[PDB]
C-alpha cells in the first residue's frame, strides 16, 4: 500500500536552483525501480556500479534523492573523475558512487517569452568544495588586499548571477532537469527494496 512518492519528486512545478539543491531521505518502502524507463520519455539514463537488472533484487536500507536544473551542455560534468565550474563550486560528486543520474529536457514548461531570471548559480569562491555539503548564504567577495568596504567598487564583487532563457535558442543551451539517486552502506536491518 505504501509506495515511495516518486511522483512527487518527478512531477513538481518548481525546481530548486543549483546552489541550493534539495535532499530527501527515503525509508520503509516497496518501490518500483523499473517504472522509470517506461514512465516517460527520458533522454538520458546512466548509472554506476550496479546494472539495471539488479536494482529490484538487491535490497537496501535508505535512499537519497536530489534534483536541480542545469543547462544542456553541462550534463557531462555530473560524473566521478570530472572537473569544471559546477563540479568545483556548486555540486561536488565523491570518488565512489553507487547511484544513478537522470536528465530530461523541460524547455516548454519554464521558458516563457519574457524569460526565467529566477534560477541562479555561483561563479566566485575562495577554495574547492568538500564532498556533500550545501550552502545558501551569499555575501561580498573581495579580490584585493584592502579590506572590503560596504560599497562594492573596483575590487569587490557580487558572487551570484542568473540565467536567461528564450524558446528560440539552439539545442545545446536549452534548460534541462537533473535528478540524482544515491545509496548508502548499511548495518541496520534493511527496509527499502523491490516488490514481488
Amino acid at each position: 500500500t505504501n509506495l515511495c512518492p516518486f511522483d512527487e519528486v518527478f512531477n513538481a512545478t518548481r525546481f530548486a536552483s543549483v546552489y541550493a539543491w534539495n535532499r530527501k531521505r527515503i525509508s520503509n518502502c516497496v518501490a518500483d525501480y523499473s517504472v522509470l524507463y517506461n514512465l516517460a520519455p527520458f533522454f538520458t539514463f546512466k548509472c554506476y556500479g550496479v546494472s539495471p537488472t539488479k536494482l529490484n533484487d538487491l535490497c537496501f536500507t535508505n535512499v537519497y534523492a536530489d534534483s536541480f536544473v542545469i543547462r544542456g551542455d553541462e550534463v557531462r560534468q555530473i560524473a566521478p573523475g570530472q572537473t569544471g565550474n559546477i563540479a568545483d563550486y556548486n555540486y561536488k560528486l565523491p570518488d565512489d558512487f553507487t547511484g544513478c543520474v537522470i536528465a530530461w529536457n523541460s524547455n516548454k514548461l519554464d521558458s516563457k517569452v519574457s524569460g526565467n531570471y529566477n534560477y541562479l548559480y555561483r561563479l566566485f569562491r575562495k577554495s574547492n568544495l568538500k564532498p556533500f555539503e550545501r550552502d545558501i548564504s551569499t555575501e561580498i567577495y573581495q579580490a584585493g588586499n584592502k579590506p572590503c568596504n560596504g560599497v562594492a567598487g573596483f575590487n569587490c564583487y557580487f558572487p551570484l548571477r542568473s540565467y536567461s532563457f528564450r524558446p528560440t535558442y539552439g539545442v545545446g543551451h536549452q534548460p534541462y532537469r537533473v535528478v540524482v539517486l544515491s545509496f548508502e552502506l548499511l548495518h541496520a536491518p534493511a527496509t527499502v527494496c523491490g516488490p514481488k
Partner: antibody
Framework: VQLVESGGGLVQPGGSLRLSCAAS????????MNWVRQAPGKGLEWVSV???????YYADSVKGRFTISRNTLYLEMNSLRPEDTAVYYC?????????????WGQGTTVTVSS | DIQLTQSPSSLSASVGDRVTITCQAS??????LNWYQQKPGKAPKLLIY???NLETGVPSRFSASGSGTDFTFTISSLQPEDIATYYC????????????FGGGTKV
C-alpha cells in the same frame, strides 16, 4: 592596479626556461590568471588559464609540456620546440558583468640562438 | 570546435562613412562576444564585452548590437586618430569549447 613581468631571452632547444610574471598589487591567490602569446605578424593565441582553486586547462598545441605556478605567477618550459617564439602576455580576463576587469602586461622576448 | 572568419581585413575609407565588420560562428555560440580594440605595439583593451552592451568610459561613436551566431559591428565615422585593428573573441574556458581569436581587420 598594475602588472609587472620579467625574464626571457637567449636559450637553446632541449633546455627548459622559466618565465617569472611576478605580479605586484594584485592578489594572485584568487584570480583567473591567463597566458596569451602574440606571434610576429600573425594572430593571437591562447595558452593556459588557472582557477582560484587548483585547476589547469591547456590548449591543443601545447600538449602536456607547459606548467603554470600560482603573490607571483610563474611559467615553465620543457624541451622547447623550434616553433615557439614571440611576445607573451599575462592576462586577467573579464568574468561576470562588471567593468574594469581587463589588465595586461607590457611584453617579453624569447629566441633560440647559439 | 568553433571556427571564426571575418570580413575583408584591408579596409580603408574616407572620413564620415560607416565601416562594417562581420563575425561568423561555426558551432552555435550565444552572445559570447567581445571586441578587443588593439593598436600596434600595445596590448589590446576591451571595448565591447557582452553583445549589445558597451563598455562605459568611451563616447558613443560605435554602433554594436546583435545576437544569434552572426554579429555585425559598425563605425559611423572614422576619425584619423581612431585608426586601429579590431578583433573578434569568444570568451569561455569550459571543456566543450575553448576560446579562440579571429583573423583581425586593419582599418
Amino acid at each position: 592596479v598594475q602588472l609587472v613581468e620579467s625574464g626571457g631571452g637567449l636559450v637553446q632547444p632541449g633546455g627548459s626556461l622559466r618565465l617569472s610574471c611576478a605580479a605586484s598589487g594584485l592578489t594572485v591567490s584568487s584570480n583567473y590568471m591567463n597566458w596569451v602569446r602574440q606571434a610576429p605578424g600573425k594572430g593571437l593565441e591562447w595558452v593556459s588559464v588557472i582557477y582560484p582553486g587548483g585547476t589547469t586547462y591547456y590548449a591543443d598545441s601545447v600538449k602536456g609540456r607547459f606548467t603554470i605556478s600560482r603573490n607571483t605567477l610563474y611559467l615553465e618550459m620543457n624541451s622547447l620546440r623550434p616553433e615557439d617564439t614571440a611576445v607573451y602576455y599575462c592576462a586577467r580576463p573579464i568574468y561576470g558583468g562588471n567593468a574594469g576587469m581587463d589588465v595586461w602586461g607590457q611584453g617579453t622576448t624569447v629566441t633560440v640562438s647559439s | 570546435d568553433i571556427q571564426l572568419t571575418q570580413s575583408p581585413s584591408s579596409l580603408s575609407a574616407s572620413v564620415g562613412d560607416r565601416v562594417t565588420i562581420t563575425c561568423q560562428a561555426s558551432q552555435d555560440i550565444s552572445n559570447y562576444l567581445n571586441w578587443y580594440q588593439q593598436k600596434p605595439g600595445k596590448a589590446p583593451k576591451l571595448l565591447i564585452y557582452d553583445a549589445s552592451n558597451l563598455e562605459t568610459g568611451v563616447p558613443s561613436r560605435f554602433s554594436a548590437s546583435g545576437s544569434g551566431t552572426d554579429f555585425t559591428f559598425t563605425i559611423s565615422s572614422l576619425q584619423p586618430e581612431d585608426i586601429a585593428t579590431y578583433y573578434c573573441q569568444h570568451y569561455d574556458d569550459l571543456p566543450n569549447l575553448p576560446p579562440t581569436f579571429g583573423g583581425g581587420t586593419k582599418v
